[PDB]
C-alpha cells in the first residue's frame, strides 16, 4: 500500500549511465567538465548529445578539475567532473587537493574498472578511493546501480554543506553499464533552527563587541558562500563602525573603495591591515580560518585582542561553520558555529549602533596613509613594473559595463594582483590559495567564464604558471569561452627567485624555465595575441586586451627580480614587516648584479 | 674504540640539503628531474650549479615524473624526481601510479612544510605520504636530518629490488635546512645464493619442458631488468627450439626478425601469437604478469597448457620475482621465484637441446602466414594509413647507425606502433602499459633522450595524447634533448571512437578535441616542424624527420575512424579474435557515414 | 544492519559520539530512513551450464560449507540435490550439521583434521559442487595438488568445480571455478536442481566411497 508510495520504479530499465544523466538534471547541473575513456564510456554514451547541460572538454583532466573549481567559485554551484579510470582519475588529484584546501564544492565522478577486476592491477586501474581519501571530504565506490542515485545525492550534499569541498564517486564500468531491475526508495531519487548554545554564544559575542574600542572585522571566503554574506558584512561594519580587512580568498567580500577598508592582511598584505589587527581589542573573524599566511608568528598574533579577552573587554569572535577550524590555530573568545551569514542575521541586531570612533579611526587612517602598496615606479627606459601593469588592468577593467572576474596563477603576479586590483564584488577573485597550484589560472578562468558567460574574465598569470597548463588554450576556444589571459612575463619563477635573492644570496637554482614564443603560441591555439614590451604600449595594449571579444593572450614584458612587498618574513609577528624602500632596492640590485656577475 | 669505526662524522656540519646532494653522488645519480618551490629550497640551494649530475627542468611536475620514467626505462637506473610540497608533490601522483603499474624504479623526493606545521592545513601542505601510499612500493617522511641518509638508501634499495617501482621520500623544509650535529652509523652513509626450494622447482620445471611437444615462451618486461636477460632468453629459445611471444612491455626482448618470433600477444596482439599460446602444452612465462590485456577471457586462457599440466606433460612455468604476482591470475605449474635472468642461468643447462619440432613449427609458420597484421592499404587520393606510417618510420629508423628508442602516447597509435615496428633491441619500447597514461610520450622521450644522448628517440604520439603534455616541448629544447615527436593526427581520440563505433552505434560522445596548429606550435616552442599531409610526402617527410639533429615535431595527417585489428573483444578467449577484412571495413564505413549523416 | 546481513554476513561498527546520542532531533528526516528493508541471465546461464557439467559427472561430490546454513531451506535443498543426483556429501568445520551425518552419503568433515575418506573422495572426484564454502587453507591442503581429478575433468570438458558463492571476492580466490554461480546458494539451488538429472545408482563411485569410509574411520 504505502510501500508503493515510498518506492520508485521510474528508473527501472535505465542503465547506470542513464541514471547518472537523470540525477545530474535533478541536481540542476548545467555544466560538466570531463574527458572520456574506456571505464566511463557507459556514462558518456548516456550523456551523448545531451541538451540538459553544457559539456566542457579540456586537454588534460587536471584542466577539467581546475575548470570545475573556477566554475564553482564563480557560480556558487558545485563543479562537476567526469573522468575515466586510472590516469584519468589520478590526473584530478591536484585539483581535488586544491579544492579541499580552498573549500571548493567539487563533485568528481571517475570511471573505474569492472567490479570483477578491482584489486587485480587491472588495465587502467588505480585505487582512486584510497589515493583521493586524504584530499576529499568524502569518497565512495558505487557497487551496484540500485545505490547509484543515493551515492550521487550523498556526494552533492557533502560537497555543498559544512565547509564546501571535493568529493569523489567511483563508478565501475559494469555498474554504469548495468540496468536497474528493482525499485528504489523514492527519497534516493531526489536531492534535498539555531541551537541555544549558539544563540547564547551570539548574545555573548555581541556584548563583547559592544565593549570594544578598537574592533576589526577579519573576513574570509566563508562570507562568500551566501549571497547575502557581503551585504550583512557591510551592515555590521556600518552599524558598529568597524574597519574591515579580508584574506586573499575574502577579496571582493568588502568594497575596497569604502573608507573602512583595510585591504588584505597577511604575509604580503597591507602593513595597515597587519598593524590594525595587531592592535585591535576585538577581532570579528567571519568565515576565515587563520591560515599561516595570515597570522604571521602565531604566538605573537593579535596581542591586543588576547589582552582584551583576558581582561573581559574583547577578544576573538569566530564565526565558523566547521568545528574542526574552531580553536584550531587561535583560541576563540566566542565560537559561533554555523553559517556566518545566518548567524550575522542574529548577531547584528544585538550589536549597538556606533556613530564615531575618533581615536581608533585616527590610527587607522594614519596607518592607511603611511602604508600604501609602495614600489619602485617606472623610470625612463625601464621595463614596465608588474605593479603598474596590475593597476592599469584594474583601472581599465572597471570601465566596462560588465562584471569582472579575476583568476590567477601562483607567484608574485598573484600577490600583485591581490594587492593592486581594486576589489569590489563577491566571487571575483578566483585564485589558488591553500594549496597554491601553479597552472590554475587558465583552466579556472575557462570554468569561471562558462559559469558567467557575460563576465569579463581575466587570468592574471605568471610565465612559469602559464607554462604548466597552457595546452588548455585550445579548450577555451572549443568551449567558446572568451577568456583574457595576461601573462606577466618576467622570464623567471619570480616568487622563488625572490626567496633565493633574500635567503640564498642570489643563488638562482633552477628557477628560470625557458618560455615559448607566447604570440606564436596564441596563434597556434587560434587565440588572439597581444604583446606589450615597453611603457608606451601599456595603456593601448591593455585596452585592446579588454576590448577583445574573443579568447586573447596578452604577454607583458615586466621588470625582473622585483620583490613583492610589504612582506612579513616567516617567524615574524604580523606587525614586524619589511616595507618597500627605494634605496634598499637600489642596493639590492647592485648586490645581485655583483654576485651574479651581471647576469641578473 | 670500534665504536668510532662504526660511526661516521663526515656529514656533521652539513645541511640536510647538502647531505641529500652527497647521497645522490654516492648512489651514482647522474640525472635529476625536478621543479623548485618554497618547501624544497634548502635542497635546491645545496644542488645549485652542481657539476655532479644533470638537472632537467620540465614545465610541469607530471613532466618531471614521466621524464624520470622514460629515463629509468631507457637506462636501467632509477629515475630521480625532486619537487616541492603541496601541488608540486600531488602533480607527481599520476607518474607514480604509472611507475607502479609498469614496474619502473622511480625515486620521488618531495619538499614538505616544516615538521612544526604538518597537520595544520599549512601553506602548500598535502598529505603526500597518505595520498601516494597506494601508488608507491613504499614511502616515508624524514623526521630528522640524522636519518636522512638511511631513508635515502632505503628508498633506492626498495625502488630497485624485487619488482622495481616508485618510492616517495617526504622532506620537511626544516629537516633539509637543519644541520647534522651528531655522528651517524657509517652503514647509513653508503649504498649497498639460490634456495633449494627454488633449485628443486627449477629442476622440476626443466623436466616438464623436456616433455613438451608444443612449447612457447611468453616473455615480458622482467627479462629486460637484467642486461643478460635477452641473451639468455635467446639461448633458451635456441637450445630447446621454442617460439617466442612477448607482451607490449617485453617488446625488444626478442629479435622479431628471428623465425621463432611470434610477435606480440594479447587483445591487440598477433592472432598467430594468440593462437600459439592457446594451443601450447608448455608455457614459459619469463618476467610477465599475465595482465588482462594479455590473457583474454581468463577461464578460457591457455587450454592446452592446463590440460597438459593435469596430465603431467606440461603446464605453465612462471619465472617471477614478486611472490604477489605468482598464482595471482593463472596457476603456475611450477613457480620459479627470483630474478628471471639468474634463474635462467640454472634452468637452461637442465633443458634438453632440441634440433627440430616439425609438427609444432609447421603450425606456427602456418599461423604466422595466415595472420599478418593486415589492414586496408592506401588507395588513390586517400589519406595516409596510420599502419603504413609506422612501417615507414620503422624501416627508415633502422637505417641509421644509432640505437633507436621509441616512446608512445596511449591509444591506437600506440598499438599500431607496437604492431608495426620491428622490435630488435631491449629497452627500446618505452610506453605506458599498465596505467596507460595519455601524455606520457613526450616527457618519456625527453627522459630517454637524456639517458641515451646518442640514441634516436622517437615519440610516436596521438593528437589527443600529445595535447595533454605538449608544453614539455620547451623542456626538450632547454634540456638539449633532440627528441623526435611524430603526431599521428587523426583529429580524434581514435581508441575511444573505435569503441564507440563498435559498441555504441557510432555515437561519438566528446571524443573529438580540437587540435592546435602543430606547426605553429612547434615554431612557438623553438622546435623544428614538419607536416605530412598526403601519401606523396610520406617517405621524404619521414626522412627529414629522422635526419634532423634538433628537436623536431612531425605531424602526419592519417586516415580517421580506422580500427586497430586484430582484436580480442572483452569476454572472449585469446583465440576468439576479430581479424581485418576489407569488405567488412567498407560496410563499417558506409554504416558510420549513414548513422552520422556523413559527418564521420 | 543491511550490510551486516547481506552478501557474506559480517561485522559492522557504528561509532556513537556522546553528544550525538545526548542530542535531540529537531528536524524531520526522510521516512525511508526510519524503516528497515530476480536472477541475472548471466547467472541463469551459468546454472544451466553447471547442470550440464554435473549431468556428465561419474564421480560427483558435494563440498558444503557455512553458506548453506544462511538460509533455513539450505540444508533441505542440499539434501534434495544429494538425493536426486546421488552424490556423497562432505562439509567444512563450519558446515557441520548442514547434512545429516547418519545418511550413508555422508563423507563427514574434510581437511587437515578431516576424515581421510572425505579427503580421498574430493581428491578423486571429477565434479565438485562447492556450496557456500570458501576453500580455506585448512580444507584444500596443498593448493597446487588439490582436486586433481576435478581439474583434469574440467580440462577435458566432463567435470570441474561448480562454485555457488554469494561473495565475488571469494569466487576464483583460491581455486578456479569451472562455473561460478553468484548469489545465495539456496536460491540458486532452487534453479539448479530441476536442471539436474535424477540418478538411481553409481555402483563404481559409491563402491570406492564405501570402501574409503570403512578403511578410514576416526
Ligand atoms: C603565494 C601565496 C601567498 C599568499 N599570501 C597570503 C596573504 O598575504 N594574505 C592572505 O590572506 N592569504 C595569502 N595566501 C592565501 C592563504 O594561503 C589562504 O589560502 C587564505 O588566507 C585563506 O583565506 P580564507 O581563510 O578566507 O579562506 P578559506 O581557506 O577557504 O577558509 C574559510 C574559512 O571559513 C569557513 N567557512 C566556509 N564557509 C563558511 C560559512 N558558510 N560560514 C561560516 N564559515 C565558513 C571555512 O570552514 C574556513 O574555516 C597566499 C597564497 C599564496 C599561494
Ligand atoms: C591501449 C593499450 C592496449 C594494450 N594492449 C596490450 C596487448 O594487446 N598485449 C600486451 O601484451 N599488452 C597490452 N597492453 C599493455 C598491458 O596493459 C600491460 O601493460 C602489459 O601487457 C604488461 O606486460 P608485462 O607483463 O611484460 O610487464 P609488467 O606489467 O611490468 O610485468 C612484469 C612482470 O615481471 C616481473 N618481473 C619484473 N622484474 C623481474 C625480474 N628481474 N625477474 C623476474 N620477474 C620480474 C614483474 O614483477 C611482473 O610480474 C596494452 C596497454 C594499453 C594502454
Ligand atoms: C584448530 C583448527 C583446525 C581446523 N581444521 C579444519 C579442518 O580440518 N576442516 C575444515 O573444514 N575446517 C577446519 N578449520 C576451520 C577452517 O579454518 C575454516 O574456518 C572453515 O573450513 C571454513 O568453512 P566454510 O568455508 O564452510 O565457512 P566460511 O569461512 O564462513 O565460508 C563460507 C563461504 O560461503 C559463502 N557464503 C556465505 N553465505 C552464503 C550464501 N547465502 N550463499 C552462498 N554463499 C555464501 C561465504 O561468502 C564464504 O565464501 C579449523 C579451524 C581451527 C581453529
Ligand atoms: C605546481 C607547482 N609547483 C611549484 C610551486 C612552487 N612555486 C613556484 C615554482 C612559483 C614561481 C611561479 O612563477 P611564475 O612565473 O608563474 O610567477 P611569478 O614570476 O610572477 O612569481 S610560485 C610557487 O609557489 C607551485 N606553487 N605549484
Ligand atoms: C590521461 C588519460 N585520459 C583518458 C584516457 C583514456 N583513453 C583516451 C581518451 C584515448 C584516446 C587517445 O587519443 P589519441 O589521439 O592520443 O590516440 P589515437 O587517436 O591514435 O587512438 S586512449 C585511452 O586509453 C587515458 N588513457 N589517459
Ligand atoms: C575506449 O578505449 C578503450 C580501450 C580498451 O583497451 C585498450 N578498452 N578495453 C575495455 S574493456 O571491455 O576490456 N573494459 C575494461 C577496462 Cl576499460 C579496464 C579493465 C578491465 C578488466 C576491463 Cl574488462 N574498454 C576499452 N576502451
Ligand atoms: C619560494 O616561494 C615561496 C613563497 C612563500 O610564501 C608565499 N614561502 N613561504 C615560505 S616559509 O618560510 O613560510 N616556509 C613554509 C612553507 Cl614553504 C610552507 C608552510 C609553512 C608553515 C612554512 Cl613556515 N617559503 C616560501 N617560498
Ligand atoms: K587593493
Ligand atoms: K612487429
Ligand atoms: Mg614569472
Ligand atoms: Mg588521435
CSV table of N, CA and C in Angstrom, one decimal, chain A residues 6-7 150 184-189, chain C residues 29-37:
chain,number,residue,atom,x,y,z
A,6,UNK,N,6.4,4.8,-1.2
A,6,UNK,CA,7.8,5.1,-0.7
A,6,UNK,C,8.9,4.5,-1.6
A,7,UNK,N,8.5,3.6,-2.5
A,7,UNK,CA,9.4,3.1,-3.5
A,7,UNK,C,9.1,3.7,-4.9
A,150,UNK,N,21.5,7.2,-4.7
A,150,UNK,CA,21.8,7.6,-3.3
A,150,UNK,C,23.2,8.2,-3.2
A,184,UNK,N,13.6,1.5,-6.1
A,184,UNK,CA,14.5,2.0,-5.1
A,184,UNK,C,13.7,3.1,-4.3
A,185,UNK,N,14.2,3.3,-3.0
A,185,UNK,CA,13.5,4.3,-2.2
A,185,UNK,C,13.4,5.6,-2.9
A,186,UNK,N,12.2,6.2,-2.9
A,186,UNK,CA,11.9,7.4,-3.7
A,186,UNK,C,12.7,8.6,-3.2
A,187,UNK,N,13.1,8.5,-1.9
A,187,UNK,CA,13.9,9.6,-1.3
A,187,UNK,C,15.3,9.7,-1.9
A,188,UNK,N,15.8,8.6,-2.4
A,188,UNK,CA,17.1,8.5,-3.1
A,188,UNK,C,17.1,9.0,-4.5
A,189,UNK,N,15.9,9.2,-5.1
A,189,UNK,CA,15.8,9.7,-6.4
A,189,UNK,C,15.6,11.2,-6.5
C,29,UNK,N,13.1,13.9,9.2
C,29,UNK,CA,14.0,13.1,8.4
C,29,UNK,C,13.3,12.2,7.4
C,30,UNK,N,14.0,11.9,6.3
C,30,UNK,CA,13.3,11.0,5.2
C,30,UNK,C,12.7,9.8,5.8
C,31,UNK,N,11.5,9.5,5.5
C,31,UNK,CA,10.7,8.5,6.2
C,31,UNK,C,11.3,7.1,5.9
C,32,UNK,N,12.0,7.0,4.7
C,32,UNK,CA,12.7,5.7,4.4
C,32,UNK,C,13.8,5.4,5.3
C,33,UNK,N,14.4,6.4,6.0
C,33,UNK,CA,15.5,6.1,6.9
C,33,UNK,C,15.0,5.7,8.3
C,34,UNK,N,13.6,5.8,8.5
C,34,UNK,CA,13.1,5.4,9.8
C,34,UNK,C,12.6,4.0,9.7
C,35,UNK,N,12.8,3.3,8.6
C,35,UNK,CA,12.3,1.9,8.4
C,35,UNK,C,13.5,1.1,7.9
C,36,UNK,N,13.5,-0.2,8.3
C,36,UNK,CA,14.4,-1.2,7.7
C,36,UNK,C,13.9,-1.6,6.3
C,37,UNK,N,14.5,-2.5,5.7
C,37,UNK,CA,14.0,-3.0,4.4
C,37,UNK,C,13.1,-4.2,4.5
